[PDB]
Design a protein around this nucleic acid. Structure first.
Ligand SMILES: [Mg+2]
Ligand SMILES: [Mg+2]
Ligand SMILES: [Mg+2]
Ligand SMILES: [Mg+2]
Ligand SMILES: [Mg+2]
Ligand SMILES: [Mg+2]
Ligand SMILES: [Mg+2]
Ligand SMILES: [Mg+2]
Ligand SMILES: [Mg+2]
Ligand SMILES: [Mg+2]
Ligand SMILES: [Mg+2]
Ligand SMILES: [Mg+2]
Ligand SMILES: [Mg+2]
Ligand SMILES: [Mg+2]
Ligand SMILES: [Mg+2]
Ligand SMILES: [Mg+2]
Ligand SMILES: [Mg+2]
Ligand SMILES: [Mg+2]
Ligand SMILES: [Mg+2]
Ligand SMILES: [Mg+2]
Ligand SMILES: [Mg+2]
Ligand SMILES: [Mg+2]
Ligand SMILES: [Mg+2]
Ligand SMILES: [Mg+2]
Ligand SMILES: [Mg+2]
Ligand SMILES: [Mg+2]
Ligand SMILES: [Mg+2]
Ligand SMILES: [Mg+2]
Ligand SMILES: [Mg+2]
Ligand SMILES: [Mg+2]
Ligand SMILES: [Mg+2]
Ligand SMILES: [Mg+2]
Ligand SMILES: [Mg+2]
Ligand SMILES: [Mg+2]
Ligand SMILES: [Mg+2]
Ligand SMILES: [Mg+2]
Ligand SMILES: [Mg+2]
Ligand SMILES: [Mg+2]
Ligand SMILES: [Mg+2]
Ligand SMILES: [Mg+2]
Ligand SMILES: [Mg+2]
Ligand SMILES: [Mg+2]
Ligand SMILES: [Mg+2]
Ligand SMILES: [Mg+2]
Ligand SMILES: [Mg+2]
Ligand SMILES: [Mg+2]
Ligand SMILES: [Mg+2]
Ligand SMILES: [Mg+2]
Ligand SMILES: [Mg+2]
Ligand SMILES: [Mg+2]
Ligand SMILES: [Mg+2]
Ligand SMILES: [Mg+2]
Ligand SMILES: [Mg+2]
Ligand SMILES: [Mg+2]
Ligand SMILES: [Mg+2]
Ligand SMILES: [Mg+2]
Ligand SMILES: [Mg+2]
Ligand SMILES: [Mg+2]
Ligand SMILES: [Mg+2]
Ligand SMILES: [Mg+2]
Ligand SMILES: [Mg+2]
Ligand SMILES: [Mg+2]
Ligand SMILES: [Mg+2]
Ligand SMILES: [Mg+2]
Ligand SMILES: [Mg+2]
Ligand SMILES: [Mg+2]
Ligand SMILES: [Mg+2]
Ligand SMILES: [Mg+2]
Ligand SMILES: [Mg+2]
Lengths: 393, 46, 339, 122, 240
RNA sequence: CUCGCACACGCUUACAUCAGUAACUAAUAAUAUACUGAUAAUUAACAACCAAUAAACCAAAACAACACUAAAACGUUUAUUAAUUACAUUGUUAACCCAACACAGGAGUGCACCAAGGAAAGAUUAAAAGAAGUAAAAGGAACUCGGCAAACACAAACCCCGCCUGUUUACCAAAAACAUCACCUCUAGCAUUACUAGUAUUAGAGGCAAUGCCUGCCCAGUGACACCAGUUUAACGGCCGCGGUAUUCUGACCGUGCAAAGGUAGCAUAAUCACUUGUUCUCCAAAUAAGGACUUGUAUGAAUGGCCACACGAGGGUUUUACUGUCUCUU
RNA sequence: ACGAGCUACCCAUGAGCAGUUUAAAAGAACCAACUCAUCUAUGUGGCAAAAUAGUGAGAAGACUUGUAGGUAGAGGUGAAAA
RNA sequence: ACCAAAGCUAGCUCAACAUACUAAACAAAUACAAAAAUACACCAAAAUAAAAUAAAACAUUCACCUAACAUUAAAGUAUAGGA
């Protein structure tokens, strides 16, 4: 084959030993005694240096197999920045879930009800969009890494302004950068969702299930799509140092146990650095399933069984202007087999909050043809956002 | 056009071209330093 | 032109006096006279608010399983900043039912605040412009941890022509010995949002002290009386910059001096301690050309720093002070006049 | 051209040339880029108590001096070990193999203030 | 001074790697090739020319991969293709009619019956029909595809005798190799590459071609239409 | 009248206070940022030094919604180790650097065109000659190599040469020279430093110059393949002599001899030896100028390319109005 | 031996091009900053060992430019001007 | 009458002898961009002397030309040389 190492760029081989070293029963005369190199004397060979007392910073990195947590079986870990090739399909296969296009009917009616809206919804949402895209910073053209979290926080505050006439949103709290770890076996594969998401909402009250018994039963007859050339573990990190322990993000006795909504942000200024929408849906599905599985194992137990009380979690992925919504209902814990009851996942995709935003006025032929502001506006996306926020109450 | 300003000062270039390390890194530069020492120069390099 | 860069979160020993000199601000201990004409609105649940605050403390100190921290120092910035964010969010959400303006208010997280102003003149000591009169320019580049912006201005604490026997402190020394250093860059006047933002008035700021200005660090540095000086300097600089930004957004400047006092509130939090301040900008004509016959002064009311909790361990708050909670509740229930 | 006789200090170069003036280091660089100062690297001045000290920076002018007799190894040995060696040899218990009881240090690697490696500045 | 090569990357990766161009200069610093330099910045996409490279030795049989996307490569004339199989993805040289979502087979099996030659599939030369158009021909078994790679270019299998394959290269030369050498079938992508028209002298500079020297040189005896016979067959088999 | 403020690079105290200047520096004085002596000074938050080891990662920046081709610097997360404990070290002046000078020159970046910087005149008189500017009767290129310069004009045409943008003799030549897209020849079947991490639709050594019509004959000699024959001119190159006929004058023809073939198409007194200011017509009142036509150029001529054509040109010539001190003829 | 801090060409790393006409960032057009240097007049021991004034060409590109590195004389580099 | 003119010393030069030959200073820093206390390496290299000149030119040749054997003679002899 064609090796990828260039000889002039690899570490050069050590120079050949002096001819005196090849003579049996002959001690070489080297320059080790004078503590400096001198021509004419043989090159002294030294044993590897042993710093009898260990130093933390200046020691060689311990090998991976020396770690006490090293395991022979390989674990496939999904962390925050893992990309899936066939995103939605791979996520559905790994989590044993069935995809549904529309949002749950409960969330849909909660959005469509005009009595759940805020006072001046259109004006307030346009103001939030304008503030996030243009006003929040003194720069002329704010960057995505700045205006994605800002717009998400503005929408969260707009939804939180609902508490005065829905006195049930105070049972929630926000968490940032907590370690989630949930492992499971999926057809002789040791998968593990491990890492941290963007933001999480915790609640005191469990989120009621949204799937009907008829839909859950009809999920049994559904067969998960299989893609042959690509293994299901493509895109995950193959590691050997891991802990098989369903450790959620919080310790025991947390006053806000039940997860409600995960928030994922693609706040990167580069398109290659950002996630594709398919990969984003896959990441939300995987983290929502991991959170639901951790909650179910903390509530009921580690036995692999079909849950009589499903666990439903929500997720919102924001590119800055494109929103993706997830409602994932976990019904089962036994996932090694592919014949039982599967979980459900309603995925609303490619929800455009606004088509485009002009941060500066455009002048064509000495006249302004389009003013400053967001071009095109779909209030239905914010309606869905508010419905997802209010689904708990 | 107008000449005479061929010297644009820069300490990095000065030290990398006529420095002590630059002189001593080659056998010919060591000979230059030895010649300057033999003549008795106050400054052997830059 | 060249200008001093005033840092509200400064390590200078006696910085409150210098900031008052730069600002024409008099500092008064204690809260401003309260408007006792308030209706019996505060029927809120002290137990509920205490439970929420304790829940935030416990979540950010013990319940949150973050990534493993190899250093044993356990820095107090990464544990108090999320606490401050969660505390502000929970308090606003719980008190928005009593105070309707908090529902429509905008919460800004670490949004920069800028203010550029002139104060006095100085003879240029060195250079080809030696001997010529040049004004002293200052710029404050602040990044408050949390801000609350409201559509309508808060009511004034004292009349615009308020007279105080205490005079503005004057320093018979150069500003370079604070130490302060001149720099030349874009001089901006920023409120946390552009002028087009309809929420051009502010309600309350929250400022988190850094790890460099901790009480233990100051005690090691042998600065026992600087513990309150740092709070005073941060409050004075930040609140003055933000009130001046509000005033110049409204349209007032040195030659168009302010007609209505601009009121702001500030909460300065260490890892454990809290302090409360109230600022009223009465005059903006701080330049030498307009300060010849300007009797108005800015006023900053201060409160002694009081700890909120006491050495919590194992999801149980040992000591809890209700005075800090009541002060925060009063600041968040301050509302604009209705008309 | 530039000078050659002038000293090449840190004031004569670009921003990236930040040369020390001869002060000893007092720490290393931590994790987030800050400088972590090591307490043990900072010298600790061992200052005695001068409250009850009855000596002054100047001597009396009438006080006589003495003939210059610099202290030598022979004189130091005669003062510190010769009487003990003589007494032990007269008693008959002298042991040539063991000399550590007389102040002799066979190896300097054990004690704190070593003499040949010179572990102490002053 | 002596420069170091940019090609120090021992790990194969799919993402493009940044490359430092050098215009005709060798490692010493003197020009060895004229008319090179001042082009556009490029990122190198590593190509796995050893088409039959099983992911693990435990399953060394034929395997199938899926084409994800056919993309433009600035470092070569042909278009590249991303193929994923198992847990790894590789850049290969796209054929004339590769598209996203296609399936490619990589084999090393030789049978008495010739296999139906698809376009993206890669089979050993001993299993292909006698009149097959091939590309990415490999000289020694397990060496790699050094031969035909350019856009639109393809070789033609001529005859297989004594367990040994004979091909005709685009230069109309006969090349004899072992019949077990793996070679991709079909023409390489970008068959219209020879018909591109450089619009101006600036596009050559974009591509990285400095102008020719202005020195006028009188033609010698080398010039003129030399009608030379075809060179003999180039054999790579080692006859004992 | 308006090149100012700051940073980077560079100089290193020339910066600040006081005092003195008879003389030394300012190309002269006044006195002083530029000379002399003494004393002081630039205080970090800005800037410099300021993690590795494996893995997931194809999907540009251009308001980036989404795209074009020339395929494009700029990143997080996961896992293992990262001494852990206030205050580290260094740059902080200036009117400044490179040009022998206190030099009308050369100098990167961000801000605004003044809110900041400065003074063309040491004092007189108003000779000649010289430099710059303004205005000028009537005429309007009659000046001159040339309409150079100037102008209340700042328009339209005909040729030569290069297709075009571009590059070149830093300091006497910017061109018609070089390059150029396009078209052709040769040399190469291949791996870890160029070519190239490329593979004959590729890469090198060259010619001529886009495009349109074409590129005629010749391997005799010298080259190069062939290791001798033989093949090659989009390889070096070449492409007739003599006698007679036209009143003198034939390149045409009739014969003859020698050749490897004996100049084909086209253009044509050319940027083409001389003859030469070839002949004729148009342009002008007058033309060795310019354009068209003839052309026989015995020394034109076809990729050392031949012919036309659009566009282009601080290229070289020629006209028409308009304009004017170029000129009559200067004031 | 010493020289690529000027210059010839490359290699890294950065930075600039405002307005007008155009479905155009088209080696398009007008024209600034900026880069060159066509013509003329002064200057000729000059402001200057190549400048000043006017006038010119390009000005989204084969473009200008900062920092640093490389190629060294039987050579380098060269859109050949020895 | 200005400008000016004259000192006799500093020190150098050539040989003899000579211990036997890179002086004194070397507290700290000095081949990071020398004078910058402090981190897992890489280090080293040799391959003829040439020519200016003379032979009135210039091609074979051209004493000394940084390699020890000094002196009195043999002796400018034997030899080597476009002899
Ligand atoms: Mg010079
Ligand atoms: Mg010098
Ligand atoms: Mg420096
Ligand atoms: Mg500097
Ligand atoms: Mg520190
Ligand atoms: Mg290439
Ligand atoms: Mg390509
Ligand atoms: Mg060519
Ligand atoms: Mg040529
Ligand atoms: Mg100087
Ligand atoms: Mg002075
Ligand atoms: Mg004078
Ligand atoms: Mg300064
Ligand atoms: Mg005068
Ligand atoms: Mg006159
Ligand atoms: Mg005149
Ligand atoms: Mg005039
Ligand atoms: Mg007139
Ligand atoms: Mg005339
Ligand atoms: Mg005349
Ligand atoms: Mg003219
Ligand atoms: Mg005209
Ligand atoms: Mg004209
Ligand atoms: Mg041209
Ligand atoms: Mg054209
Ligand atoms: Mg041109
Ligand atoms: Mg050039
Ligand atoms: Mg030039
Ligand atoms: Mg010239
Ligand atoms: Mg030109
Ligand atoms: Mg010229
Ligand atoms: Mg040409
Ligand atoms: Mg053709
Ligand atoms: Mg030519
Ligand atoms: Mg042609
Ligand atoms: Mg021909
Ligand atoms: Mg021949
Ligand atoms: Mg022949
Ligand atoms: Mg000839
Ligand atoms: Mg006749
Ligand atoms: Mg003709
Ligand atoms: Mg002629
Ligand atoms: Mg004429
Ligand atoms: Mg003739
Ligand atoms: Mg001819
Ligand atoms: Mg010719
Ligand atoms: Mg020819
Ligand atoms: Mg013309
Ligand atoms: Mg021209
Ligand atoms: Mg007159
Ligand atoms: Mg260099
Ligand atoms: Mg250079
Ligand atoms: Mg433009
Ligand atoms: Mg253009
Ligand atoms: Mg000029
Ligand atoms: Mg003029
Ligand atoms: Mg100009
Ligand atoms: Mg122009
Ligand atoms: Mg033009
Ligand atoms: Mg010679
Ligand atoms: Mg040469
Ligand atoms: Mg020439
Ligand atoms: Mg010549
Ligand atoms: Mg001679
Ligand atoms: Mg002679
Ligand atoms: Mg001669
Ligand atoms: Mg001679
Ligand atoms: Mg000789
Ligand atoms: Mg002989």
């Amino acid at each position: 084959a064609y090796e990828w190492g260039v000889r002039s760029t690899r570490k050069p081989e050590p120079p050949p030993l002096d001819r005196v070293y090849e003579i049996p029963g002959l001690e070489p005369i080297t320059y080790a005694g004078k503590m400096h190199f001198m021509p004419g004397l043989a090159r002294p060979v030294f044993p590897p240096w042993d710093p009898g007392w260990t130093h933390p910073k200046f020691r060689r990195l311990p090998p991976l197999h020396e770690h006490p947590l090293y395991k022979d079986q390989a674990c496939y870990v999904f962390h925050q920045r893992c990309r899936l090739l066939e995103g939605v399909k791979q996520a559905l296969w790994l989590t044993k879930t069935q995809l549904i296009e529309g949002l749950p009917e409960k969330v849909l009616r909660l959005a469509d009800d005009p009595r759940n809206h805020i006072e001046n919804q259109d004006e307030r949402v346009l103001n939030a969009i304008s503030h996030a895209r243009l006003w929040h910073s003194t720069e002329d053209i704010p960057k995505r890494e700045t205006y994605c979290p800002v717009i998400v926080d503005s929408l969260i505050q707009l939804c939180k302004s609902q508490i005065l006439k829905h006195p049930s949103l105070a049972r929630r709290i926000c968490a940032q950068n907590n370690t989630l770890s949930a492992t499971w076996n999926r057809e002789s594969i040791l998968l593990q969702v491990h890492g941290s998401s963007g933001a999480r909402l915790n609640a005191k009250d469990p989120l009621p299930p949204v799937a009907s018994q008829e839909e859950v039963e009809a999920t049994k007859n559904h067969v998960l799509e299989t893609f042959y050339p690509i293994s299901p573990t493509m895109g995950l990190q193959e590691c050997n140092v891991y802990d098989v322990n369903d450790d959620t993000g919080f310790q025991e006795g947390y006053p806000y146990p039940c997860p409600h909504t995960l928030y994922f942000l693609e706040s990167a200024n580069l398109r290659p650095r950002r996630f594709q929408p398919d990969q984003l849906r896959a990441k939300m599905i995987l983290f929502a399933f991991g959170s639901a599985l951790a909650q179910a194992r903390l509530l009921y137990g580690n036995d692999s069984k079909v849950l009589e009380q499903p666990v439903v979690v929500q997720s919102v992925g924001t590119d800055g202007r494109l929103f993706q919504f997830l409602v994932l209902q976990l019904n089962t814990t036994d996932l090694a087999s592919d014949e039982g009851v599967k979980n459900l996942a309603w995925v609303d995709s490619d929800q455009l909050l606004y088509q485009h935003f002009w941060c500066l006025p455009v002048i064509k032929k000495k006249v302004v043809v389009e003013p400053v502001g967001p071009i095109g506006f779909q209030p239905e996306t914010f309606r869905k956002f508010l419905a997802l926020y209010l689904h708990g109450a | 056009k107008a000449r005479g300003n061929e010297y644009q000062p820069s300490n990095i270039k000065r030290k990398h071209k006529h420095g002590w390390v630059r002189r001593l890194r080659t056998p010919t530069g060591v000979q230059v330093i030895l010649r300057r020492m033999h003549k008795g120069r106050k400054s052997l390099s830059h | 032109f060249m200008k001093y860069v005033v840092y509200p979160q400064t390590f200078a020993l006696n910085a409150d006096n210098w900031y008052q000199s730069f600002t024409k601000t008099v500092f008064l201990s204690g809260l401003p006279p309260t408007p006792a004409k308030l209706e019996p609105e505060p029927t809120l649940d002290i137990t509920a608010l205490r439970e929420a605050v304790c829940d935030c403390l416990l979540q950010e100190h013990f319940f949150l399983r973050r990534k493993k921290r190899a250093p044993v120092i356990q820095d107090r910035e990464a544990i108090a900043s999320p606490f401050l964010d969660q505390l502000v969010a929970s308090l606003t959400g719980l008190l928005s039912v009593h105070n309707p303006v908090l529902a429509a208010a905008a919460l800004d997280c670490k949004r920069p605040v800028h203010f550029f102003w002139l104060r006095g003149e100085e003879i240029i000591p060195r250079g080809h412009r030696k001997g010529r009169v040049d004004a002293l320019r200052y710029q404050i580049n602040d990044k408050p941890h949390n801000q609350i912006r409201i559509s309508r201005q808060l009511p004034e604490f004292v009349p615009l022509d308020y007279s105080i026997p205490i005079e503005v402190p004057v320093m018979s020394c150069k500003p370079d010995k604070l130490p302060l250093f001149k720099r030349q860059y874009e001089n901006t006047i920023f409120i946390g949002s552009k002028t087009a933002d309809p929420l051009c008035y502010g309600h309350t700021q929250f400022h988190l002290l850094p790890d460099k200005l901790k009480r233990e660090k100051l005690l090691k540095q042998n600065c026992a009386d600087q513990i309150e000086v740092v709070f005073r300097a941060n409050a004075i600089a930040s609140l003055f910059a933000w009130t001046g930004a509000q005033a110049m957004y409204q349209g007032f400047w040195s030659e168009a001096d302010v007609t209505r006092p601009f009121v702001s509130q500030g909460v300065i939090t260490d890892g454990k301690y809290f302090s409360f301040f109230c600022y009223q900008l009465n005059t903006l004509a701080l330049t030498a050309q307009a300060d010849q016959n300007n009797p108005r002064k800015n006023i900053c009311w201060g409160t002694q720093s009081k700890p909120l909790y006491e050495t919590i361990e194992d999801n149980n708050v040992k000591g809890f002070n209700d005075d800090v909670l009541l002060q925060l509740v009063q600041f968040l229930l301050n509302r604009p006049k209705e008309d | 051209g530039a000078d050659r006789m002038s000293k090449w200090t840190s004031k004569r170069g670009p921003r990236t040339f930040c040369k020390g003036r001869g002060a000893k280091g007092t720490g290393f660089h931590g994790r987030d880029g800050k400088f972590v100062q090591i307490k043990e690297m900072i010298p600790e001045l061992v200052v005695p108590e001068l409250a009850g000290f009855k000596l002054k920076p100047y001597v009396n002018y009438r006080a006589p001096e003495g003939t210059d007799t610099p202290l030598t190894a022979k004189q130091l040995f005669l003062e510190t070990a010769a009487p003990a060696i003589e007494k032990d040899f007269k008693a008959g218990t002298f042991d040539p193999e063991h000399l550590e009881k007389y102040g002799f240090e066979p190896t300097q690697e054990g004690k704190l203030f070593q003499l040949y490696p010179k572990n102490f500045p002053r | 001074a002596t420069s170091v090569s940019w090609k120090s990357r021992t790990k194969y990766t799919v993402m493009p790697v940044k490359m430092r161009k050098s215009g005709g200069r060798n490692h010493t610093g003197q020009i060895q090739v004229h008319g090179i330099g001042g082009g556009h910045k490029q990122r190198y996409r590593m190509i796995d020319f050893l088409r039959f490279r099983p992911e693990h030795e435990s399953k060394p049989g034929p395997f199938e991969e899926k084409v994800i996307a056919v993309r433009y490569d600035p470092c070569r004339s042909a278009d590249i293709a991303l193929v994923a199989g198992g847990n790894r993805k590789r850049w290969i040289i796209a054929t004339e009619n590769m598209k996203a979502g296609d399936t490619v087979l990589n084999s090393d099996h030789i049978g008495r019956m010739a296999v139906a030659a698809r376009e993206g599939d890669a089979h050993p030369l001993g299993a292909l029909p006698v009149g097959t158009l091939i590309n990415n021909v490999e000289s020694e078994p397990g060496r790699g595809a050094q031969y035909i790679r350019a856009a639109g270019t393809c070789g033609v299998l001529l005859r297989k005798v004594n367990g040994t394959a004979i091909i005709q290269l685009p230069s109309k030369r006969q090349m004899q190799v072992l019949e077990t050498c793996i070679a991709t079938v079909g023409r390489v992508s970008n068959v219209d590459h020879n018909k591109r028209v450089i619009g101006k002298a600036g596009r050559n500079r974009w591509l990285g071609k400095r102008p020719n020297s202005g020195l006028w040189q009188r033609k010698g005896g080398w010039a003129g239409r030399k009608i030379r016979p075809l060179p003999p067959m180039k054999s790579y088999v080692k006859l004992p």
